[PDB]
Structure formats: C-alpha cells, structure tokens
Design a protein around this nucleic acid. Structure first.
Length: 103
DNA sequence: TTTAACAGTTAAGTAT
DNA sequence: AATACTTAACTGTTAA
C-alpha cells in the first residue's frame, strides 16, 4: 500500500491496481454493466464499482453528470455553455445541465 | 434569475 | 465474475 499519496484500489478480478487519486482525470460508466472506466493520464482501466461511492471518497471527486465523476484537481477548463469538462491530458467529458454550475 | 413537466434513458441493487 | 431483471432517479428540452 502506497501510504504517502492517496490511492484507490481498482479491482479487475484477483488483480488489483492501486492508482494515485491524481493520476485519474475522470471516471465514466462502462458500456459493460456494473463496470466503470478510470481515465488516467494515458491509460484507461475498467473495473467494478459505482460512481456514487467514488464521489463519497473525497471532495475532489465530483458527480458532474449521471455517467461521470471528475477529479477536480485535473480539470484544466470548462466550456460551461456546451457543458464540457477539459482535463490536463486533453481528454474531455460531459457535465449535466443540473450539475455543471456546481463543479 | 428560478423550478419543473415531459418522456426516453441509465446506474446500481439484488439474484444467480 | 458477469450476466439478467428491476426501477428510482437521472437526462436535455421546453416552458412558465
């Protein structure tokens, strides 16, 4: 366990990936049921979990949409007119009409 | 500025 | 683990 930097355990079977919080740009729901995808700097990791629980982990993790939890620390900008969140790695995700202002 | 009606879509609980 | 079944609570649009 990495104790000096906050980390999350993402489980894909008996295999665990420990990922540092700020490696993660955002989580999105998978097209595969009950799975999420962690979008990291240059990789994506699919695992079992739920968005509600991740948002309760830490203030930096905010439910910006029914299908997205964003890491506030890795937001570069927001196009609040179109409701798009841009991240430091050049990815983007969507914010909902109801949540976008609260980011 | 605010809240919400509408009707289609989805996240997550519980079972297996 | 990964799928089926379920339904409250979400979605953007539109209106007031």
């Amino acid at each position: 366990m990495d104790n000096s930097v906050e980390t999350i355990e993402l489980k894909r079977g008996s295999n665990s990936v420990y990922v540092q919080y700020d490696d993660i740009m955002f989580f999105e729901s998978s097209t595969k049921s009950h799975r999420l995808i962690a979008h990291l700097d240059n990789r994506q990791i699919e695992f079992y979990g739920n968005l509600k629980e991740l948002s309760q982990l830490d203030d930096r993790f905010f439910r910006c949409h029914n299908s997205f939890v964003v890491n506030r620390h890795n937001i570069e900008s927001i196009d609040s007119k179109e409701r798009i969140v841009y991240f430091k790695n050049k990815e983007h995700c969507y914010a909902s009409v109801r949540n976008v202002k609260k980011i």
